[PDB]
Amino acid sequence: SNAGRQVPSKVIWDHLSTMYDMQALHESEILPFPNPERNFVLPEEIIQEVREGK
Amino acid sequence: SNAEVKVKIPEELKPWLVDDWDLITRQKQLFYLPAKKNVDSILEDYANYKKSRGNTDNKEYAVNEVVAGIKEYFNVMLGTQLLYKFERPQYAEILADHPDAPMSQVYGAPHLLRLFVRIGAMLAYTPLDEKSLALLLNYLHDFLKYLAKNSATLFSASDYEVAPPEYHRKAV
Questions:
Q1: Which CATH architecture has domain B1-172?
Q2: Domain spans of chain B, in order of start
Q3: Among A2, A27, A50, B25, which has the minimal tally of Cβ within 10 Å of its Cβ?
Protein backbone atom coordinates (compact mmCIF):
# COMPACT_ATOMS: atom_id res chain seq x y z
CA SER A 1 0.00 0.00 0.00
CA ASN A 2 2.31 2.74 1.27
CA ALA A 3 6.05 3.00 0.51
CA GLY A 4 5.35 1.05 -2.66
CA ARG A 5 7.23 2.33 -5.70
CA GLN A 6 4.64 1.33 -8.30
CA VAL A 7 5.48 -2.32 -8.94
CA PRO A 8 8.69 -4.44 -8.87
CA SER A 9 7.56 -5.66 -12.28
CA LYS A 10 9.01 -2.47 -13.80
CA VAL A 11 12.04 -1.97 -11.55
CA ILE A 12 13.65 -5.41 -11.50
CA TRP A 13 12.24 -6.76 -14.72
CA ASP A 14 12.88 -3.27 -16.03
CA HIS A 15 16.56 -4.09 -16.48
CA LEU A 16 15.98 -7.80 -17.01
CA SER A 17 13.60 -7.06 -19.89
CA THR A 18 15.53 -4.19 -21.49
CA MET A 19 18.66 -6.37 -21.37
CA TYR A 20 16.83 -9.07 -23.31
CA ASP A 21 14.29 -7.02 -25.33
CA MET A 22 11.80 -8.88 -23.17
CA GLN A 23 10.27 -5.44 -22.64
CA ALA A 24 7.74 -6.33 -25.33
CA LEU A 25 6.49 -9.31 -23.37
CA HIS A 26 6.33 -7.85 -19.87
CA GLU A 27 4.80 -4.64 -21.25
CA SER A 28 1.98 -6.55 -22.92
CA GLU A 29 1.75 -8.93 -19.97
CA ILE A 30 2.52 -7.01 -16.80
CA LEU A 31 2.81 -8.58 -13.35
CA PRO A 32 0.10 -7.43 -10.89
CA PHE A 33 -0.38 -10.87 -9.29
CA PRO A 34 -3.88 -10.89 -7.73
CA ASN A 35 -2.53 -13.79 -5.68
CA PRO A 36 -5.24 -15.15 -3.34
CA GLU A 37 -4.88 -17.10 -0.11
CA ARG A 38 -4.30 -20.73 -0.98
CA ASN A 39 -3.22 -23.64 1.21
CA PHE A 40 0.24 -24.55 -0.12
CA VAL A 41 -0.43 -28.34 -0.16
CA LEU A 42 2.17 -30.41 -2.03
CA PRO A 43 2.33 -32.05 -5.49
CA GLU A 44 1.76 -35.79 -5.08
CA GLU A 45 4.59 -36.68 -7.46
CA ILE A 46 7.13 -35.36 -4.97
CA ILE A 47 5.54 -37.33 -2.14
CA GLN A 48 5.53 -40.56 -4.16
CA GLU A 49 9.06 -39.92 -5.45
CA VAL A 50 10.35 -39.69 -1.89
CA ARG A 51 8.15 -42.30 -0.25
CA GLU A 52 6.79 -44.66 -2.91
CA GLY A 53 9.87 -44.47 -5.12
CA LYS A 54 11.02 -47.97 -4.21
CA SER B 1 -5.09 -30.23 -22.05
CA ASN B 2 -3.31 -26.96 -21.18
CA ALA B 3 0.41 -27.22 -21.91
CA GLU B 4 1.55 -25.97 -18.52
CA VAL B 5 5.18 -25.25 -17.69
CA LYS B 6 7.04 -28.34 -16.49
CA VAL B 7 9.77 -27.39 -14.03
CA LYS B 8 11.80 -30.03 -12.23
CA ILE B 9 12.06 -29.09 -8.59
CA PRO B 10 15.49 -30.26 -7.29
CA GLU B 11 15.11 -33.93 -6.39
CA GLU B 12 17.83 -33.31 -3.83
CA LEU B 13 15.31 -31.10 -2.06
CA LYS B 14 12.23 -33.25 -2.70
CA PRO B 15 12.84 -35.26 0.55
CA TRP B 16 12.98 -31.89 2.31
CA LEU B 17 9.74 -30.74 0.64
CA VAL B 18 7.95 -33.88 1.77
CA ASP B 19 9.59 -33.55 5.19
CA ASP B 20 8.31 -29.99 5.67
CA TRP B 21 4.85 -31.06 4.49
CA ASP B 22 4.99 -34.17 6.69
CA LEU B 23 5.84 -32.00 9.69
CA ILE B 24 2.93 -29.59 9.18
CA THR B 25 0.21 -32.05 8.26
CA ARG B 26 1.17 -35.51 9.49
CA GLN B 27 3.40 -34.62 12.45
CA LYS B 28 1.10 -31.71 13.37
CA GLN B 29 4.18 -29.58 13.99
CA LEU B 30 4.34 -25.84 13.41
CA PHE B 31 7.12 -23.33 12.93
CA TYR B 32 6.48 -20.63 15.49
CA LEU B 33 9.84 -18.93 15.94
CA PRO B 34 12.19 -16.55 14.09
CA ALA B 35 15.11 -18.35 12.47
CA LYS B 36 18.56 -16.78 12.17
CA LYS B 37 19.24 -18.60 8.92
CA ASN B 38 16.71 -16.67 6.86
CA VAL B 39 15.84 -16.39 3.16
CA ASP B 40 17.28 -12.90 2.62
CA SER B 41 20.59 -13.93 4.20
CA ILE B 42 20.79 -16.96 1.90
CA LEU B 43 19.87 -14.74 -1.04
CA GLU B 44 22.72 -12.38 -0.17
CA ASP B 45 25.02 -15.36 0.42
CA TYR B 46 24.27 -16.69 -3.07
CA ALA B 47 24.45 -13.21 -4.61
CA ASN B 48 27.93 -12.62 -3.20
CA TYR B 49 28.97 -16.19 -4.02
CA LYS B 50 28.58 -15.63 -7.76
CA LYS B 51 30.63 -12.45 -7.38
CA SER B 52 33.44 -13.92 -5.29
CA ARG B 53 34.14 -16.65 -7.86
CA GLY B 54 34.38 -14.13 -10.67
CA ASN B 55 34.40 -10.42 -9.91
CA THR B 56 32.36 -8.83 -12.68
CA ASP B 57 30.22 -5.74 -13.28
CA ASN B 58 27.89 -7.17 -15.89
CA LYS B 59 26.87 -10.25 -13.92
CA GLU B 60 27.03 -8.41 -10.59
CA TYR B 61 23.81 -6.44 -10.99
CA ALA B 62 22.34 -9.41 -12.86
CA VAL B 63 22.63 -11.70 -9.84
CA ASN B 64 21.73 -8.75 -7.61
CA GLU B 65 18.38 -7.92 -9.19
CA VAL B 66 17.45 -11.55 -9.89
CA VAL B 67 17.92 -12.09 -6.15
CA ALA B 68 15.75 -9.02 -5.57
CA GLY B 69 13.25 -10.66 -7.90
CA ILE B 70 13.17 -13.79 -5.75
CA LYS B 71 12.76 -11.47 -2.77
CA GLU B 72 9.68 -9.73 -4.20
CA TYR B 73 8.38 -12.99 -5.69
CA PHE B 74 8.61 -14.49 -2.20
CA ASN B 75 6.92 -11.46 -0.64
CA VAL B 76 3.93 -11.66 -3.01
CA MET B 77 3.39 -15.36 -2.23
CA LEU B 78 4.69 -16.01 1.32
CA GLY B 79 1.59 -15.37 3.41
CA THR B 80 -0.92 -16.27 0.74
CA GLN B 81 0.34 -18.90 -1.69
CA LEU B 82 3.18 -20.46 0.30
CA LEU B 83 1.36 -20.97 3.59
CA TYR B 84 -0.75 -23.77 5.05
CA LYS B 85 -4.06 -23.06 6.77
CA PHE B 86 -2.49 -24.56 9.89
CA GLU B 87 0.26 -21.92 9.74
CA ARG B 88 -2.30 -19.12 9.99
CA PRO B 89 -2.11 -19.14 13.87
CA GLN B 90 1.70 -18.98 13.90
CA TYR B 91 1.61 -16.31 11.19
CA ALA B 92 -0.52 -13.95 13.27
CA GLU B 93 1.48 -14.89 16.36
CA ILE B 94 4.93 -14.17 14.91
CA LEU B 95 3.58 -11.12 13.07
CA ALA B 96 2.24 -9.69 16.34
CA ASP B 97 5.17 -10.66 18.57
CA HIS B 98 7.74 -9.45 16.04
CA PRO B 99 6.02 -6.74 13.92
CA ASP B 100 9.44 -5.32 13.10
CA ALA B 101 10.90 -8.46 11.54
CA PRO B 102 10.20 -9.46 7.90
CA MET B 103 8.60 -12.82 7.12
CA SER B 104 11.45 -13.61 4.75
CA GLN B 105 13.54 -13.65 7.92
CA VAL B 106 11.46 -15.26 10.65
CA TYR B 107 10.33 -18.26 8.57
CA GLY B 108 13.90 -19.23 7.77
CA ALA B 109 15.08 -21.45 4.91
CA PRO B 110 12.32 -24.21 5.04
CA HIS B 111 9.69 -21.80 3.70
CA LEU B 112 11.94 -20.67 0.82
CA LEU B 113 11.56 -23.92 -1.15
CA ARG B 114 7.79 -23.40 -1.29
CA LEU B 115 8.24 -20.40 -3.60
CA PHE B 116 9.57 -22.49 -6.49
CA VAL B 117 6.79 -25.04 -6.05
CA ARG B 118 4.00 -22.49 -6.57
CA ILE B 119 5.80 -20.09 -8.91
CA GLY B 120 5.86 -22.72 -11.66
CA ALA B 121 2.08 -22.95 -11.50
CA MET B 122 1.40 -19.22 -11.54
CA LEU B 123 3.88 -18.71 -14.38
CA ALA B 124 1.82 -21.23 -16.35
CA TYR B 125 -0.96 -18.64 -16.51
CA THR B 126 1.54 -16.01 -17.60
CA PRO B 127 3.39 -17.80 -20.41
CA LEU B 128 6.36 -15.98 -21.90
CA ASP B 129 8.51 -17.58 -24.58
CA GLU B 130 10.85 -20.46 -23.94
CA LYS B 131 13.91 -18.23 -24.13
CA SER B 132 12.99 -15.62 -21.51
CA LEU B 133 11.61 -18.38 -19.30
CA ALA B 134 14.82 -20.36 -19.86
CA LEU B 135 16.99 -17.54 -18.50
CA LEU B 136 14.67 -17.24 -15.51
CA LEU B 137 14.68 -20.98 -14.84
CA ASN B 138 18.43 -20.96 -15.50
CA TYR B 139 19.21 -18.64 -12.60
CA LEU B 140 16.43 -20.19 -10.49
CA HIS B 141 17.85 -23.69 -10.99
CA ASP B 142 21.35 -22.32 -10.43
CA PHE B 143 20.21 -20.89 -7.10
CA LEU B 144 18.43 -24.16 -6.24
CA LYS B 145 21.63 -26.01 -7.13
CA TYR B 146 23.60 -23.95 -4.61
CA LEU B 147 20.67 -24.14 -2.20
CA ALA B 148 20.67 -27.95 -2.22
CA LYS B 149 24.47 -27.95 -2.05
CA ASN B 150 24.58 -26.11 1.27
CA SER B 151 21.20 -27.47 2.41
CA ALA B 152 22.74 -29.65 5.16
CA THR B 153 23.67 -26.50 7.07
CA LEU B 154 20.94 -24.46 5.40
CA PHE B 155 17.61 -26.01 6.29
CA SER B 156 16.59 -26.69 9.87
CA ALA B 157 13.22 -28.45 9.84
CA SER B 158 13.98 -29.68 13.35
CA ASP B 159 12.65 -26.36 14.70
CA TYR B 160 9.14 -27.52 13.84
CA GLU B 161 7.49 -28.28 17.16
CA VAL B 162 4.27 -30.24 17.62
CA ALA B 163 1.36 -27.85 18.13
CA PRO B 164 -0.43 -28.61 21.43
CA PRO B 165 -4.27 -28.81 21.70
CA GLU B 166 -4.39 -25.38 23.35
CA TYR B 167 -2.57 -23.97 20.32
CA HIS B 168 -5.00 -25.72 17.97
CA ARG B 169 -7.67 -23.51 19.53
CA LYS B 170 -6.31 -20.73 17.28
CA ALA B 171 -6.70 -22.89 14.18
CA VAL B 172 -10.32 -23.88 14.75
A1: Orthogonal Bundle (1.10)
A2: 1-172
A3: A2
